[PDB]
Design a protein around this ligand. Structure first.
Ligand SMILES: CNCc1sc(-c2ccccc2)nc1C
Ligand SMILES: CNCc1sc(-c2ccccc2)nc1C
Ligand SMILES: [Cl-]
Ligand SMILES: [Cl-]
Lengths: 133, 132
């Protein structure tokens, strides 16, 4: 299941963060998004699918997935819709929050640490899994 | 060499796009950024370095690289400062009419560029990096 991702939302400081986890490796892509809307969700899914070979995304199936825009983007990219990362990830953002003005910066520092931490990191694992394929 | 990227800027519709190319594979990460400033450049470099093992970035060494923020982000991430780009605007040209917003058209263009195929740029970067 090299192509399988899980997408969840998490909230901090009145802002919305989408976190996509590659299930088999635990590698994450996460970004603060303007609002939890289908348009912004579709944008995030298109970004992810351009960077890794995404076949299926497990989502929470809420409001921002019911609309025409998200359905059209998943169709176009060839994606089918069919834990406590949020916790660990918030924990690391908690550790780094004071070093960046903006939450978004702190989010990308937390992604870096999560993906690089090692006897393989999540980044080494996703590449190995996909290379094997 | 697996860890080597090139970062360039390109402009379209009064907005700024940064494009990072993994030199050995031609794989691209690109996005529209709010302004070509040290703060936004630093943000884009940290994003990239969190997602791939980035050792060296070749940049154009202009104004948005001389400041304290960018130097500190490259330090923190362990990055040193030491072709596809017209292709990219071409694809964006091909898809512009299908998304309202430029940002959307950019990510569609990245997808097509990275998946287009013996191997795509996406298959090549994973193969190269997995080899080590
Ligand atoms: C599979 N072995 C090579 C890799 S891949 C890697 C990495 C990839 C993505 C994010 C973070 C680290 N670091 C190393 C040392
Ligand atoms: C190395 N072989 C497995 C891959 S990797 C891949 C891909 C990775 C990133 C962006 C686009 C495609 N497609 C496939 C079929
Ligand atoms: Cl969500
Ligand atoms: Cl630049």
């Amino acid at each position: 299941s090299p192509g399988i991702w899980q997408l969840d939302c998490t909230h901090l400081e009145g802002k919305v963060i989408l976190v996509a986890v590659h299930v088999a490796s635990g590698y994450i892509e996460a970004e603060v998004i303007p609002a939890e809307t289908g348009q912004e969700t579709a944008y995030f899914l298109l970004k992810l699918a351009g960077r890794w070979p995404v076949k299926t995304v497990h989502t929470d199936n809420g409001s921002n997935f019911t609309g025409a825009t998200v359905r059209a983007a998943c169709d176009w990219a060839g994606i089918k819709q069919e834990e406590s990362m949020n916790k660990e990830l918030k924990k690391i953002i908690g550790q780094v929050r004071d070093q960046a003005e903006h939450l978004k910066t702190a989010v990308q520092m937390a992604v870096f640490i999560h993906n690089h931490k090692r006897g393989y990191s999540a980044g080494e694992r996703i590449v190995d899994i996909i290379a094997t394929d």
